[PDB]
Curated annotation (Swiss-Prot):
The chain holds residues 393 to 473 of 1040 of the full protein. It is found in: Nucleus. Homodimer. Component of the RAG complex composed of core components RAG1 and RAG2, and associated component HMGB1 or HMGB2. Interacts with DCAF1, leading to recruitment of the CUL4A-RBX1-DDB1-DCAF1/VPRBP complex to ubiquitinate proteins and limit error-prone repair during V(D)J recombination. The RING-type zinc finger mediates the E3 ubiquitin-protein ligase activity. The NBD (nonamer binding) DNA-binding domain mediates the specific binding to the nonamer RSS motif by forming a tightly interwoven homodimer that binds and synapses 2 nonamer elements, with each NBD making contact with both DNA molecules. Each RSS is composed of well-conserved heptamer (consensus 5'-CACAGTG-3') and nonamer (consensus 5'-ACAAAAACC-3') sequences separated by a spacer of either 12 bp or 23 bp. Catalytic component of the RAG complex, a multiprotein complex that mediates the DNA cleavage phase during V(D)J recombination. V(D)J recombination assembles a diverse repertoire of immunoglobulin and T-cell receptor genes in developing B and T-lymphocytes through rearrangement of different V (variable), in some cases D (diversity), and J (joining) gene segments. In the RAG complex, RAG1 mediates the DNA-binding to the conserved recombination signal sequences (RSS) and catalyzes the DNA cleavage activities by introducing a double-strand break between the RSS and the adjacent coding segment. This is V(D)J recombination-activating protein 1. Residues 1-64 bind DNA. Autoubiquitinated in the presence of CDC34/UBCH3.
Length: 81
DNA sequence: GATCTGGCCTGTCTTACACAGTGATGCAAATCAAGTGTGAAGCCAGACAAAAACCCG
């Protein structure tokens, strides 16, 4: 009810229960059973309102499996060679 | 007896059998560290007007 960095996982849960309600219903009725992409783009927009295309591109990269992730074939290459 | 020949003995000669990987130095290239005011690529403005993909008489 006060802040969120100190509010725990379920404290935040009870804080935005109704946020979750609306977002899940709208998502799984509009995108035909999906919440990942809609919450993804929601956070992208709500952070890009502060024109932080650096973090936007970084998050789109981690969603695209390229950057600070080392896809398992790469780590396997390193362990072998 | 005298010699022939065949067997064994070395004796050379042929191909082959394990070196790139270690930690160190040492130069060349990159960057980067400030200065300070720029413009440029998007941001987003609620609301409005020309195209691709597919429904529809």
């Amino acid at each position: 009810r006060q802040h969120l960095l100190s509010l725990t996982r379920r404290a935040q849960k009870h804080r935005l229960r109704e946020l979750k309600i609306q977002v899940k219903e709208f998502a799984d009725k509009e995108e035909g059973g999906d919440v990942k992409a809609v919450c993804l783009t929601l956070f992208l927009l709500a952070l890009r309102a502060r024109n932080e295309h650096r973090q936007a591109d970084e998050l789109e990269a981690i969603m695209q499996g390229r950057g600070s992730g080392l896809q398992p074939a790469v780590c396997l290459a390193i362990r072998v060679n």
